[PDB]
Design a protein around this ligand. Structure first.
Ligand SMILES: Cc1cc2nc3c(=O)[nH]c(=O)nc-3n(C[C@H](O)[C@H](O)[C@H](O)COP(=O)(O)OP(=O)(O)OC[C@H]3O[C@@H](n4cnc5c(N)ncnc54)[C@H](O)[C@@H]3O)c2cc1C
Ligand SMILES: Cc1cc2nc3c(=O)[nH]c(=O)nc-3n(C[C@H](O)[C@H](O)[C@H](O)COP(=O)(O)OP(=O)(O)OC[C@H]3O[C@@H](n4cnc5c(N)ncnc54)[C@H](O)[C@@H]3O)c2cc1C
Ligand SMILES: COc1ccc2[nH]cc(CCNC(C)=O)c2c1
Ligand SMILES: COc1ccc2[nH]cc(CCNC(C)=O)c2c1
Ligand SMILES: [Zn+2]
Ligand SMILES: [Zn+2]
Lengths: 228, 228
């Protein structure tokens, strides 16, 4: 019996993003999976990487190096509880779904801050200890992204480039780096411009894909997949 | 005369980023330029895109849509003042320099939230009015980035892929989108690994480049430049 974490980054429960999150919960629930949702905005999740992320006393109180300090806090069980709460959710999950609108060819800052502060060295990766040596191997990850731009725009010769090109930092630089196998992204192009019925189709595509998510092989998370 | 804004995203004044920011201020100062720095961590800059960013009557109080509400608020002058404060700095600047450490093949969340909240519709772009018709046309922008990974790792055949691939969402999807011309990036690779003379070299290389910044031409911020 499979365990899923949804990390959800939208301000509005009635949004397209909210509905994608809610049918994921509905469908994965119906299947009998264990489901957990991190509703970042509702949590007022802190995005900033600061010295407040370490409790007690610093490994080097004179010069603050966030990566060093968080690595030695993880090893010594002195990370801030908001971090470690999320790390627990990840540790337990077989699959991590990220549900977000595209902000500047990336994730909204609040979700960027989740990646920055939750995926610390010792938990997600070490230096050295990354990519296939990353610490979240055996887990699946999946980006479920909504865009303002059309599919059209997201082509190699289109104004925005191929959508793969913006996935690189997220899928490869982040999710692969950490050991994840990367399920094929779910991209919901341009719902604010789509008709009701097209929107319904995209939600149902997502509901249906979700019926057979566990039968999926990861994408090959390569430069060639993304650029060639 | 020329006017520079440095948007700086590092927690530690004694860091390698801190040194790069200060040599920029020193050199650009020496040349007679007008220089302004937004030290985001020191400002406790808010990264989250929330309904707190609009103080006036919302256009749809039942269903919150951050893009629609911020676009309206900018036109009516009911955005949060922290946003407006940054927009004034950008509007005055001839050149915007971003100084940051690479976090997950991207900017630190606090700086992502600057992008998200400061570059709103009406101020930075319109629909229509983006890419070469973006509202910040006539301005220059430059990413000054530091990394953990070495240069070799950031090559087409190295584990990270070429350095330009991770620049795409920044340079193209954000800066060119808003009309900026983009000067070639300054990438200071792996300062932590480097020797102290090589670190000094990197600082001084940046200072030296800034001597002739105003004579540079922008890159052609296309898919071909980034991906080949
Ligand atoms: C800071 C910022 C940066 C941005 N940067 C980019 C960028 O780089 N690239 C880009 O392409 N876009 C960008 N965008 C736009 C953003 O990606 C899209 O606006 C977002 O993806 C749309 O998703 P949403 O959930 O808010 O849509 P919504 O507007 O909330 O939903 C679209 C419509 O679907 C309806 N809907 C909701 N649930 C259902 C349902 N169950 N069935 C049918 N219809 C339903 C809603 O009611 C609504 O009418 C940016 C936006 C912001 C604010
Ligand atoms: C959340 C997170 C995610 C990351 N993701 C990535 C990623 O995707 N890819 C990647 O490659 N890296 C990544 N890193 C690594 C990060 O990019 C590097 O740690 C960072 O760029 C190093 O810069 P710094 O200023 O912090 O270095 P510092 O550690 O501050 O500097 C290195 C040394 O230079 C010294 N120094 C300072 N000023 C000078 C001077 N004037 N002359 C000589 N020496 C000087 C310092 O004192 C120090 O000893 C990540 C780190 C974190 C925390
Ligand atoms: C994809 O390369 C990455 C990804 C995440 C990372 N975090 C950290 C490093 C290197 C140095 N360590 C710190 C300071 O965190 C790093 C490299
Ligand atoms: C880099 O693309 C971006 C960046 C910021 C943005 N904010 C809102 C949108 C949607 C714009 N809608 C269309 C179809 O043009 C948007 C796109
Ligand atoms: Zn990969
Ligand atoms: Zn471009």
């Amino acid at each position: 019996g499979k365990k899923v974490l949804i990390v959800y980054a939208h301000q509005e429960p009635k949004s397209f993003n909210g509905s994608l999150k809610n049918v994921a919960v509905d469908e994965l629930s119906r299947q009998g999976c264990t489901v957990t949702v991190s509703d970042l905005y509702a949590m007022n999740f802190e995005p900033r990487a600061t010295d407040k992320d370490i409790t007690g006393t610093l490994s080097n109180p004179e010069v603050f190096n966030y990566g060093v300090e968080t690595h030695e806090a993880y090893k010594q069980r002195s990370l801030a509880s908001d971090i470690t709460d999320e790390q627990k959710k990840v540790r337990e999950a077989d699959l991590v779904i990220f549900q977000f609108p595209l902000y500047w060819f990336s994730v909204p800052a609040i979700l960027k801050g989740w990646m920055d502060r939750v995926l610390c060295q010792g938990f997600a990766f070490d230096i050295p200890g990354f990519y296939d040596s990353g610490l979240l191997q055996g887990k699946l990850a999946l980006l479920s992204v909504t865009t303002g731009g059309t599919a059209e725009m997201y082509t190699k010769t289109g104004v925005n480039g191929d959508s793969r090109y913006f996935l690189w930092p997220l899928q490869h630089g982040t999710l692969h780096f950490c050991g994840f196998k990367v399920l094929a992204p779910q991209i919901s192009f341009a719902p604010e411009i789509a008709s009701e019925e097209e929107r319904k189709g995209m939600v149902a595509a997502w509901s249906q894909r979700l019926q057979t998510i566990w039968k999926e092989e990861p994408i090959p998370c390569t430069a060639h997949w993304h650029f060639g």
